[PDB]
Amino acid sequence: KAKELREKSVEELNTELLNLLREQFNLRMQAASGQLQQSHLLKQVRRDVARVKTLLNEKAGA
Amino acid sequence: MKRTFQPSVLKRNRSHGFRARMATKNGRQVLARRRAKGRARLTVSK
Amino acid sequence: SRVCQVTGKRPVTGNNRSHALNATKRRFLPNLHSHRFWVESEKRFVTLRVSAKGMRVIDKKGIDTVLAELRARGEKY
Amino acid sequence: MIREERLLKVLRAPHVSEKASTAMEKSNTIVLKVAKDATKAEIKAAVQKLFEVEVEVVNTLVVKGKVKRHGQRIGRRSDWKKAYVTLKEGQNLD
Amino acid sequence: AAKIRRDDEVIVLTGKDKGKRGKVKNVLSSGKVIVEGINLVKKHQKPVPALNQPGGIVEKEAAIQVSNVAIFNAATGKADRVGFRFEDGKKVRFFKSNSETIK
RNA sequence: UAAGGUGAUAUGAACCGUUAUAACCGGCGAUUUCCGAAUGGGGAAACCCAGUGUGUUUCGACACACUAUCAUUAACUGAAUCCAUAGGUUAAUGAGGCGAACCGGGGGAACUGAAACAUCUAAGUACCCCGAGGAAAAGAAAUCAACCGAGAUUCCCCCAGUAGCGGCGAGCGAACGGGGAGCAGCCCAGAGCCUGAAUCAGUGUGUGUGUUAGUGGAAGCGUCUGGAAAGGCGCGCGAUACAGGGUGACAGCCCCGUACACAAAAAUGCACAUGCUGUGAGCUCGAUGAGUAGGGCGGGACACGUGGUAUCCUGUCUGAAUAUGGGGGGACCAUCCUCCAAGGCUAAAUACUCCUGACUGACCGAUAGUGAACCAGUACCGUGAGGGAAAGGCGAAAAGAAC
RNA sequence: CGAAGGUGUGCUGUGAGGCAUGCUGGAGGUAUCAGAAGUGCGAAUGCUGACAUAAGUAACGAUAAAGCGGGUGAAAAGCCCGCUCGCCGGAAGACCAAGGGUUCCUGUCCAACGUUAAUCGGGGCAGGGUGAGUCGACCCCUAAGGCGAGGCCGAAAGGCGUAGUCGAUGGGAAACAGGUUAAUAUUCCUGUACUUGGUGUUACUGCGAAGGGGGGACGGAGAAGGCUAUGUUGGCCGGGCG
RNA sequence: UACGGUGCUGAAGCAACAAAUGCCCUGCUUCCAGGAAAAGCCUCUAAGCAUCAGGUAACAUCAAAUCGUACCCCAAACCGA
């Protein structure tokens, strides 16, 4: 997804990151209960977040 | 019968703990030696 | 530390030999002395822990020169 | 003022147990697993934002990890922070 | 640069199922393949209440060494060896005997 | 580079991926909690407590940066005290700590031997301390030699267990000279002319060649025994590849490789080539290292134990000449010969292996080999420094024994 | 078509030994003549492991003591329940510090551990459990003492020490009663309290420290007097009529 | 009534006497051997600031973080294998 997310603004990125974080939180909440029967999702979300962070760093002073 | 070891944590730490070891040159040397050996517990420190 | 500031004379080790040649370790300390030296240029006394040899050297050369040398060496006075 | 991002990270899970259940039912108090670094205020903030529910007070405690033995090898479970969060009267939590 | 792959029909050079043929089912990182119908073992499957397994003498396909199988060339009617070569900026396998590309 | 993947004990679950952002491998980046030199202050290491400033706030608070010490230089400030200096506050630069051995320096034992023991030996060893480098140190004759000559240092073989030293005991033990490895010479004590002239370091660029992923890489079938063939017996083929490892028993031709031939977007080592910054070459005139050389007293080093003892170093007290001069040639003198101390720099041959890769072994094969083939510096023991084990093998394949 | 190794047998050599072969074993061995040695073990109060002997012997860890009924169970002297009995009671009870670090509670299991059995356990496995403005630490302050910028001293390492900064075992703000869990409670809940900080206020109007002063701030023994904790008796209230 | 317990309910709830080694008492009396420190706390001003801040006054609001809290603790859990 990085090539797609690279074509964005800083503000845009930040919002996306926030959203991702929220999603992750939700997953965690679900995971703890017996709701989440799709574990890979959590793995994905974290990765996405990381990618976003990396992108942000690249943008701001690199 | 009052046996020799009469534990006290603070006393132990002050005596033998990491910071004490650091404080002196000989202590430092000891630490270094331990490291070289491969000790898991470098000091008395928990 | 017993070190002439002008000359650099430290203590050196050696032996006491007895009449039966019994070596025993000893030191040879330098003949140090703290002496106020008048510095004519700056118009003040500079105290220096110096050997008698150091003093002699100073006399020979001029205190100023000695001071300069010391400075060059990175030594406070 | 706690950062949104920080808040999201704070709260680890709901804690299911008899005691917890009792707390929920009788005293209107939810029992959460939270980050070990998460202070009380932060936790409260997280609760308010992320569950949308007024908080009366948060009590925290640190649970020490049990030492176990997997076959011959000894090994310790992690410490973790439990939080009893008391919700205001009439606050029903999903 | 792996000469045998998932969906290749192979012939067995050695063992109890030597001479027989079968499609490779899957290939393992250990340097062994599992081929369809070839190396069979009658495992005694231990029942478990969970996962809906009844438990019985199940005849399943054990692995075989990749070295023990060979890619079969349909044209020659025989086992062959595989070579590698670049056709149109892309690496492809070919039968050593007859020099034709694997497709 | 790919058709398979999501490290291991260790399956499963939920998934991703298959001609190219799945996974894997390599370059350059990003992230990099806390403790630790630990450096904002403190501290019972992985914890406690700040200050200042810049931004934000839903005004409850957040965030993130900086704040050690010393050295050096600079700026401002500044006592007794007039000027000054000490001191003080900032700023910049560097240092600090760790690390196997080797290296140089500062200190420095004893057991032991002498069939006792004190000189002597062990030994400038062990050990402690400081400092450095990929090597270090040494180094460009005030050196040897012998009236012939050699031509800085270092290292190897001789010289030679010689000459010597030595309670002339135990022991210690050269040099000259010869054969080799490698070889390199320069600058300042200073000013004149000429002005960018050799060389060196940092730093870009270019070329060559490595290194850090990789790619291709030959040729075998039948039959007998057998659980299985790579074995037997037949008949073939490859070989710049019969190194090695695996594969159901021993395989050149089944697999991985091997010989051989190729490969780098990116980073980077070493050679030369070249630009820029600093550095000054050649010429003439000189100048030619003083509390120094020597000496006395005391020690130490020289194979050399004070001896008839040259030479070097110096704790102590002295103290020249200064090239028409001075040093040395093993007491000392005379003659001759030979060199120019009291300022520096300097590659190579030499020393070592914590570590990386490749290959080898009349080396070990589980009481051996590392203490450690195994989750070992672990368990366990000890207040602590510290000590410190035992423990490998089902099968070809779990087909690990349903009922 | 069975290597080494293991184990029998037969033959053979003057001996160390050798050859052959049955069984076991399941993959290596190696003639000859040379070469090199970690080359031969019964002893070393040798070292390591294994296994004997004494011997089914001594002992089973305070002479506070048991008995029976029922339960569960494969099985009960030992576990659970009950009724008796006995022991401690300035402790063998209750609550802490130190030290330990999950031993707490529940379910479950009995190989090993428990000096016997064990259904039980401080044993195995799984899950649960520790809630603070006022308790303690942290924090502010210091003692003995430690470290210590500069500094003085010292071959080096380092020693001593000023300013300072650490250091409790001492000084420094504040909470009680009841109820509750299988397991926490001055921490949860119920009631009723207190503290010292900010911030904002209106009201007022001398505030301000690295300094001054007070205070904090203190020994042994003795003697009482006033009290309460607490206990006894009566009253009261509930129950009883053997 | 899952024989563990849970829910409701609830009388009197006084007096006298005795009484600590506990409290008043960091007191008092006495003795010689002559009995921590520093902060919190109260107070005084200096430099300062000056009609601002700061101080005390009540009242409102916010605040009190962090770590410990199980269990044993004269012992079968600590020091003695």
Tab-separated table of C-alpha atoms (C1' of nucleotides) in Angstrom, chain F:
chain	number	residue	atom	x	y	z
F	1	U	C1'	15.563	-14.186	-6.355
F	2	A	C1'	11.050	-16.524	-6.637
F	3	A	C1'	6.200	-20.518	-6.519
F	4	G	C1'	5.845	-20.982	-2.420
F	5	G	C1'	5.332	-18.620	2.341
F	6	U	C1'	3.608	-16.359	7.872
F	7	G	C1'	11.902	-18.150	12.631
F	8	A	C1'	12.433	-22.587	16.443
F	9	U	C1'	10.629	-26.459	20.392
F	10	A	C1'	5.472	-27.278	17.504
F	11	U	C1'	1.557	-28.653	15.652
F	12	G	C1'	-2.759	-26.161	14.616
F	13	A	C1'	-5.672	-21.586	13.692
F	14	A	C1'	-6.437	-17.403	10.699
F	15	C	C1'	-4.298	-15.961	6.337
F	16	C	C1'	-1.033	-14.135	2.225
F	17	G	C1'	1.018	-15.445	-2.660
F	18	U	C1'	1.949	-18.065	-7.858
F	19	U	C1'	5.214	-13.730	-13.438
F	20	A	C1'	5.437	-10.420	-10.085
F	21	U	C1'	5.622	-4.341	-4.068
F	22	A	C1'	3.964	-13.092	-1.096
F	23	A	C1'	8.154	-15.021	1.430
F	24	C	C1'	13.465	-15.353	1.257
F	25	C	C1'	18.752	-12.885	0.296
F	26	G	C1'	21.948	-8.222	-0.234
F	27	G	C1'	22.919	-2.417	-0.412
F	28	C	C1'	21.187	2.343	1.452
F	29	G	C1'	17.587	4.373	4.807
F	30	A	C1'	13.649	4.727	8.967
F	31	U	C1'	12.198	3.296	13.735
F	32	U	C1'	15.394	2.228	17.821
F	33	U	C1'	11.384	1.787	25.434
F	34	C	C1'	14.378	1.723	29.997
F	35	C	C1'	19.438	0.630	32.451
F	36	G	C1'	24.577	1.066	31.353
F	37	A	C1'	30.538	5.960	30.156
F	38	A	C1'	25.190	7.468	31.253
F	39	U	C1'	25.992	12.909	30.761
F	40	G	C1'	19.745	17.561	34.098
F	41	G	C1'	20.061	16.107	39.963
F	42	G	C1'	19.688	11.730	42.824
F	43	G	C1'	19.821	6.307	43.303
F	44	A	C1'	19.445	-0.028	46.544
F	45	A	C1'	21.357	-0.611	37.623
F	46	A	C1'	16.833	-1.319	34.380
F	47	C	C1'	14.002	3.430	39.373
F	48	C	C1'	12.920	8.533	42.083
F	49	C	C1'	12.719	13.966	41.366
F	50	A	C1'	13.502	18.425	38.576
F	51	G	C1'	14.565	23.239	36.022
F	52	U	C1'	14.385	26.291	31.537
F	53	G	C1'	12.396	27.338	26.899
F	54	U	C1'	9.299	26.714	22.626
F	55	G	C1'	4.152	25.081	21.036
F	56	U	C1'	-0.739	23.519	22.059
F	57	U	C1'	-5.470	22.997	25.626
F	58	U	C1'	-11.699	20.326	25.155
F	59	C	C1'	-7.688	25.063	30.091
F	60	G	C1'	-7.621	19.119	33.703
F	61	A	C1'	-2.866	19.470	31.335
F	62	C	C1'	0.171	17.755	27.238
F	63	A	C1'	4.251	17.424	23.973
F	64	C	C1'	9.279	17.771	22.541
F	65	A	C1'	14.064	19.896	22.977
F	66	C	C1'	17.872	21.370	26.020
F	67	U	C1'	20.348	21.429	30.960
F	68	A	C1'	27.014	16.333	33.394
F	69	U	C1'	32.307	16.896	34.165
F	70	C	C1'	37.138	18.040	32.435
F	71	A	C1'	40.424	20.167	28.661
F	72	U	C1'	41.044	23.815	25.019
F	73	U	C1'	39.760	28.442	22.500
F	74	A	C1'	36.550	32.704	22.206
F	75	A	C1'	33.034	36.320	24.014
F	76	C	C1'	30.952	38.994	27.896
F	77	U	C1'	31.584	39.897	33.002
F	78	G	C1'	34.687	40.590	37.293
F	79	A	C1'	37.203	40.564	43.848
F	80	A	C1'	40.369	41.880	48.030
F	81	U	C1'	42.857	46.573	45.034
F	82	C	C1'	43.903	51.811	41.321
F	83	C	C1'	44.807	49.162	36.790
F	84	A	C1'	45.107	44.138	36.447
F	85	U	C1'	44.768	38.988	37.828
F	86	A	C1'	42.013	35.137	40.379
F	87	G	C1'	37.051	34.046	40.005
F	88	G	C1'	32.083	33.980	37.357
F	89	U	C1'	28.251	33.173	33.024
F	90	U	C1'	27.703	31.836	28.167
F	91	A	C1'	29.331	29.628	23.245
F	92	A	C1'	32.028	26.269	20.120
F	93	U	C1'	35.419	21.922	19.527
F	94	G	C1'	37.431	17.452	21.675
F	95	A	C1'	37.608	13.886	25.397
F	96	G	C1'	35.252	10.141	28.807
F	97	G	C1'	33.452	4.013	28.387
F	98	C	C1'	34.193	-1.116	26.355
F	99	G	C1'	37.395	-4.520	23.967
F	100	A	C1'	41.286	-11.324	22.924
F	101	A	C1'	46.322	-11.153	22.149
F	102	C	C1'	50.488	-8.326	20.410
F	103	C	C1'	53.286	-3.139	21.615
F	104	G	C1'	55.821	1.097	24.609
F	105	G	C1'	56.323	3.174	29.287
F	106	G	C1'	55.546	3.588	35.178
F	107	G	C1'	55.873	0.150	39.428
F	108	G	C1'	57.316	-5.015	40.616
F	109	A	C1'	57.189	-10.224	43.992
F	110	A	C1'	57.863	-15.000	45.963
F	111	C	C1'	57.970	-20.061	45.656
F	112	U	C1'	62.249	-22.265	43.325
F	113	G	C1'	67.809	-23.312	42.155
F	114	A	C1'	72.409	-22.755	44.649
F	115	A	C1'	71.308	-30.207	47.088
F	116	A	C1'	71.253	-25.304	53.873
F	117	C	C1'	71.563	-19.797	53.130
F	118	A	C1'	72.263	-14.185	52.942
F	119	U	C1'	75.486	-12.220	47.311
F	120	C	C1'	73.431	-14.704	43.186
F	121	U	C1'	69.162	-17.348	40.874
F	122	A	C1'	63.966	-17.488	39.736
F	123	A	C1'	63.201	-12.429	36.682
F	124	G	C1'	62.502	-7.423	35.087
F	125	U	C1'	58.976	-13.285	34.998
F	126	A	C1'	53.915	-13.235	37.516
F	127	C	C1'	51.011	-9.395	38.778
F	128	C	C1'	49.192	-4.003	39.233
F	129	C	C1'	48.985	0.854	36.687
F	130	C	C1'	49.138	4.510	32.247
F	131	G	C1'	49.115	5.104	26.964
F	132	A	C1'	48.876	3.808	21.794
F	133	G	C1'	48.366	1.463	17.086
F	134	G	C1'	46.962	-1.843	13.222
F	135	A	C1'	50.810	-2.971	14.231
F	136	A	C1'	53.848	-0.710	18.093
F	137	A	C1'	58.781	0.456	19.322
F	138	A	C1'	63.448	1.690	16.960
F	139	G	C1'	65.655	4.604	13.103
F	140	A	C1'	69.285	8.146	9.464
F	141	A	C1'	75.854	7.467	13.327
F	142	A	C1'	78.965	12.504	18.467
F	143	U	C1'	77.806	3.922	15.057
F	144	C	C1'	81.171	0.165	14.211
F	145	A	C1'	85.954	-1.021	12.373
F	146	A	C1'	91.342	-1.252	12.416
F	147	C	C1'	95.313	1.971	9.399
F	148	C	C1'	91.618	-2.154	5.113
F	149	G	C1'	87.016	-0.564	5.216
F	150	A	C1'	81.646	-0.600	6.355
F	151	G	C1'	77.558	2.829	6.024
F	152	A	C1'	69.891	4.346	9.762
F	153	U	C1'	66.377	0.896	12.358
F	154	U	C1'	63.864	-3.931	12.706
F	155	C	C1'	63.666	-9.309	12.008
F	156	C	C1'	65.879	-14.623	10.776
F	157	C	C1'	70.469	-18.120	10.473
F	158	C	C1'	75.577	-18.231	12.040
F	159	C	C1'	79.518	-16.352	15.057
F	160	A	C1'	79.031	-19.467	20.263
F	161	G	C1'	77.467	-21.977	24.885
F	162	U	C1'	82.867	-18.961	22.371
F	163	A	C1'	84.893	-14.109	24.926
F	164	G	C1'	83.639	-12.746	29.346
F	165	C	C1'	80.655	-12.257	33.944
F	166	G	C1'	80.123	-15.383	38.439
F	167	G	C1'	79.809	-16.864	47.071
F	168	C	C1'	84.824	-17.719	39.632
F	169	G	C1'	79.391	-21.537	42.986
F	170	A	C1'	74.537	-22.469	41.026
F	171	G	C1'	74.126	-20.149	36.977
F	172	C	C1'	74.327	-15.779	33.407
F	173	G	C1'	76.206	-15.077	28.489
F	174	A	C1'	77.705	-11.147	24.413
F	175	A	C1'	80.043	-8.551	20.493
F	176	C	C1'	83.188	-8.131	16.102
F	177	G	C1'	82.556	-10.373	11.642
F	178	G	C1'	79.666	-13.343	7.812
F	179	G	C1'	74.951	-15.198	5.282
F	180	G	C1'	69.830	-13.578	4.442
F	181	A	C1'	64.535	-10.807	4.804
F	182	G	C1'	63.556	-5.774	3.654
F	183	C	C1'	65.688	-1.304	2.385
F	184	A	C1'	64.301	5.527	2.204
F	185	G	C1'	65.530	9.011	3.635
F	186	C	C1'	63.919	13.931	5.431
F	187	C	C1'	62.789	18.565	8.188
F	188	C	C1'	63.397	22.715	12.200
F	189	A	C1'	66.973	25.658	15.122
F	190	G	C1'	66.667	31.644	9.481
F	191	A	C1'	67.136	34.768	6.596
F	192	G	C1'	68.147	36.446	1.178
F	193	C	C1'	66.771	35.398	-3.768
F	194	C	C1'	63.454	33.349	-6.886
F	195	U	C1'	57.526	31.999	-6.158
F	196	G	C1'	53.206	27.457	-6.133
F	197	A	C1'	58.599	23.501	-8.285
F	198	A	C1'	58.888	17.336	-5.452
F	199	U	C1'	56.158	14.973	-1.262
F	200	C	C1'	52.060	14.149	2.329
F	201	A	C1'	47.110	14.549	4.344
F	202	G	C1'	41.947	15.460	3.938
F	203	U	C1'	38.292	15.623	-0.096
F	204	G	C1'	35.204	15.304	-4.779
F	205	U	C1'	35.437	13.014	-9.763
F	206	G	C1'	37.132	9.136	-13.283
F	207	U	C1'	39.273	4.166	-14.414
F	208	G	C1'	40.773	-0.722	-12.915
F	209	U	C1'	40.114	-4.375	-9.478
F	210	G	C1'	38.037	-6.757	-5.265
F	211	U	C1'	33.994	-7.169	-1.129
F	212	U	C1'	28.797	-7.008	0.345
F	213	A	C1'	22.978	-10.767	-3.106
F	214	G	C1'	23.525	-13.843	-7.283
F	215	U	C1'	23.130	-16.695	-12.713
F	216	G	C1'	24.127	-20.836	-15.964
F	217	G	C1'	26.805	-25.225	-15.117
F	218	A	C1'	28.044	-31.958	-18.411
F	219	A	C1'	26.620	-37.121	-18.804
F	220	G	C1'	22.559	-43.989	-17.272
F	221	C	C1'	19.814	-47.474	-18.574
F	222	G	C1'	18.638	-52.839	-18.171
F	223	U	C1'	18.778	-56.972	-14.916
F	224	C	C1'	19.701	-60.186	-9.743
F	225	U	C1'	19.539	-60.011	-4.513
F	226	G	C1'	16.823	-56.984	-1.208
F	227	G	C1'	12.368	-53.528	3.013
F	228	A	C1'	14.907	-50.096	-0.166
F	229	A	C1'	20.042	-50.211	-4.863
F	230	A	C1'	23.765	-45.864	-5.071
F	231	G	C1'	25.732	-53.014	-4.389
F	232	G	C1'	26.357	-57.681	-8.086
F	233	C	C1'	26.191	-58.890	-13.425
F	234	G	C1'	25.589	-56.632	-18.338
F	235	C	C1'	26.151	-52.958	-21.879
F	236	G	C1'	26.759	-47.293	-22.482
F	237	C	C1'	27.945	-41.930	-21.982
F	238	G	C1'	30.501	-36.929	-19.422
F	239	A	C1'	34.898	-35.211	-17.644
F	240	U	C1'	39.150	-27.641	-17.652
F	241	A	C1'	33.536	-31.077	-13.572
F	242	C	C1'	35.960	-38.562	-10.190
F	243	A	C1'	36.323	-31.692	-4.341
F	244	G	C1'	32.705	-32.568	-0.995
F	245	G	C1'	27.694	-33.510	0.945
F	246	G	C1'	22.797	-35.748	0.573
F	247	U	C1'	19.361	-39.346	-1.463
F	248	G	C1'	15.549	-46.201	1.918
F	249	A	C1'	22.957	-50.259	1.555
F	250	C	C1'	28.645	-48.002	-1.405
F	251	A	C1'	26.090	-42.779	-7.146
F	252	G	C1'	31.157	-38.974	-12.138
F	253	C	C1'	25.975	-39.417	-15.145
F	254	C	C1'	19.072	-38.822	-9.047
F	255	C	C1'	19.652	-34.032	-6.147
F	256	C	C1'	22.755	-30.010	-4.165
F	257	G	C1'	27.290	-28.817	-5.842
F	258	U	C1'	32.369	-29.004	-8.296
F	259	A	C1'	35.693	-27.197	-13.057
F	260	C	C1'	34.617	-23.394	-16.184
F	261	A	C1'	32.052	-19.060	-17.803
F	262	C	C1'	29.212	-14.733	-16.332
F	263	A	C1'	26.669	-10.905	-12.653
F	264	A	C1'	25.628	-5.223	-9.034
F	265	A	C1'	20.568	-0.365	-8.848
F	266	A	C1'	23.311	0.706	-4.230
F	267	A	C1'	27.311	0.984	-0.657
F	268	U	C1'	32.297	0.455	0.074
F	269	G	C1'	38.233	-1.161	0.537
F	270	C	C1'	42.992	-0.812	-2.322
F	271	A	C1'	45.829	0.936	-6.626
F	272	C	C1'	47.023	4.499	-10.048
F	273	A	C1'	44.775	9.109	-13.010
F	274	U	C1'	42.876	14.067	-11.833
F	275	G	C1'	40.502	18.699	-9.606
F	276	C	C1'	40.272	21.733	-5.061
F	277	U	C1'	41.954	23.013	-0.111
F	278	G	C1'	46.407	23.319	3.234
F	279	U	C1'	51.746	21.985	2.857
F	280	G	C1'	56.039	24.144	0.777
F	281	A	C1'	60.652	22.177	-3.598
F	282	G	C1'	65.515	23.910	-6.016
F	283	C	C1'	69.628	28.034	-5.113
F	284	U	C1'	73.002	31.174	-2.094
F	285	C	C1'	74.648	32.620	2.528
F	286	G	C1'	75.080	31.071	6.987
F	287	A	C1'	73.730	29.109	11.638
F	288	U	C1'	74.972	23.972	13.768
F	289	G	C1'	70.522	21.996	20.139
F	290	A	C1'	74.193	24.450	28.180
F	291	G	C1'	72.428	23.778	33.641
F	292	U	C1'	74.100	20.347	28.434
F	293	A	C1'	78.896	17.175	27.951
F	294	G	C1'	82.058	16.061	31.774
F	295	G	C1'	82.934	15.478	37.254
F	296	G	C1'	81.828	14.055	42.798
F	297	C	C1'	78.244	11.136	46.036
F	298	G	C1'	74.021	7.202	45.590
F	299	G	C1'	71.493	3.836	42.564
F	300	G	C1'	70.079	1.455	37.966
F	301	A	C1'	71.144	-0.513	32.629
F	302	C	C1'	74.805	-2.578	29.494
F	303	A	C1'	76.442	-10.720	29.081
F	304	C	C1'	79.824	-7.562	32.416
F	305	G	C1'	77.778	-8.830	40.472
F	306	U	C1'	82.941	-2.292	41.415
F	307	G	C1'	86.130	-5.113	39.752
F	308	G	C1'	91.934	-2.825	36.761
F	309	U	C1'	85.931	-1.299	34.378
F	310	A	C1'	85.300	1.595	29.482
F	311	U	C1'	79.837	2.850	27.630
F	312	C	C1'	74.471	4.485	28.678
F	313	C	C1'	70.517	6.448	32.240
F	314	U	C1'	70.040	9.853	36.530
F	315	G	C1'	68.052	11.100	42.661
F	316	U	C1'	71.800	14.566	44.634
F	317	C	C1'	75.745	18.595	44.501
F	318	U	C1'	78.552	20.849	40.653
F	319	G	C1'	79.872	22.165	35.666
F	320	A	C1'	83.170	23.131	30.175
F	321	A	C1'	84.731	23.888	25.198
F	322	U	C1'	81.438	25.445	21.692
F	323	A	C1'	84.662	23.227	15.132
F	324	U	C1'	91.454	26.542	15.740
F	325	G	C1'	86.030	22.904	19.113
F	326	G	C1'	83.914	18.406	20.959
F	327	G	C1'	82.487	12.665	21.263
F	328	G	C1'	84.280	7.557	20.744
F	329	G	C1'	87.893	3.675	19.719
F	330	G	C1'	86.593	-1.199	27.145
F	331	A	C1'	91.136	1.766	33.251
F	332	C	C1'	94.628	5.925	31.766
F	333	C	C1'	98.074	8.717	28.527
F	334	A	C1'	100.212	9.873	23.657
F	335	U	C1'	99.653	9.208	18.384
F	336	C	C1'	96.321	7.961	14.464
F	337	C	C1'	91.452	6.650	12.764
F	338	U	C1'	86.477	7.775	13.040
F	339	C	C1'	81.977	10.486	14.178
F	340	C	C1'	79.395	15.438	15.441
F	341	A	C1'	75.514	14.720	21.510
F	342	A	C1'	72.659	18.004	24.247
F	343	G	C1'	65.445	19.386	18.559
F	344	G	C1'	62.169	16.472	15.750
F	345	C	C1'	59.753	13.099	11.663
F	346	U	C1'	59.973	8.457	8.884
F	347	A	C1'	57.279	3.005	4.958
F	348	A	C1'	59.242	-1.982	4.566
F	349	A	C1'	60.943	-6.809	6.391
F	350	U	C1'	58.734	-8.122	12.676
F	351	A	C1'	54.667	-9.368	16.803
F	352	C	C1'	49.490	-11.013	17.689
F	353	U	C1'	43.972	-13.123	16.560
F	354	C	C1'	38.153	-11.265	20.303
F	355	C	C1'	36.596	-11.589	15.015
F	356	U	C1'	35.223	-12.938	9.055
F	357	G	C1'	35.719	-16.350	4.850
F	358	A	C1'	37.839	-20.432	2.445
F	359	C	C1'	40.616	-24.985	2.750
F	360	U	C1'	43.632	-28.891	5.401
F	361	G	C1'	44.732	-32.704	9.332
F	362	A	C1'	48.992	-40.665	10.476
F	363	C	C1'	43.930	-34.391	15.630
F	364	C	C1'	39.271	-36.021	19.317
F	365	G	C1'	34.555	-38.913	18.396
F	366	A	C1'	30.434	-38.217	24.011
F	367	U	C1'	34.626	-40.441	31.016
F	368	A	C1'	37.539	-38.097	24.352
F	369	G	C1'	37.296	-33.131	22.046
F	370	U	C1'	36.147	-26.599	24.628
F	371	G	C1'	33.919	-26.387	31.144
F	372	A	C1'	29.860	-26.615	27.375
F	373	A	C1'	27.932	-31.792	20.530
F	374	C	C1'	22.140	-31.192	24.619
F	375	C	C1'	18.584	-23.718	25.823
F	376	A	C1'	26.074	-24.227	29.866
F	377	G	C1'	29.046	-20.343	32.271
F	378	U	C1'	23.027	-23.016	32.643
F	379	A	C1'	21.424	-25.982	37.070
F	380	C	C1'	23.584	-26.136	41.678
F	381	C	C1'	27.077	-24.269	45.480
F	382	G	C1'	28.988	-19.659	47.863
F	383	U	C1'	27.499	-12.893	51.831
F	384	G	C1'	30.904	-12.149	47.970
F	385	A	C1'	35.168	-12.368	44.683
F	386	G	C1'	34.443	-16.970	42.868
F	387	G	C1'	33.519	-22.115	41.879
F	388	G	C1'	30.676	-25.018	38.390
F	389	A	C1'	28.333	-30.141	36.600
F	390	A	C1'	25.443	-34.074	34.496
F	391	A	C1'	22.960	-34.828	30.163
F	392	G	C1'	24.083	-36.927	22.295
F	393	G	C1'	21.824	-41.579	18.801
F	394	C	C1'	13.607	-44.845	17.477
F	395	G	C1'	13.062	-45.451	12.229
F	396	A	C1'	14.437	-44.780	5.456
F	397	A	C1'	9.955	-42.408	6.602
F	398	A	C1'	6.112	-41.080	12.612
F	399	A	C1'	4.080	-44.996	9.240
F	400	G	C1'	4.829	-42.593	17.266
F	401	A	C1'	0.902	-48.084	17.860
F	402	A	C1'	-7.055	-46.702	15.468
F	403	C	C1'	-9.777	-50.740	17.792
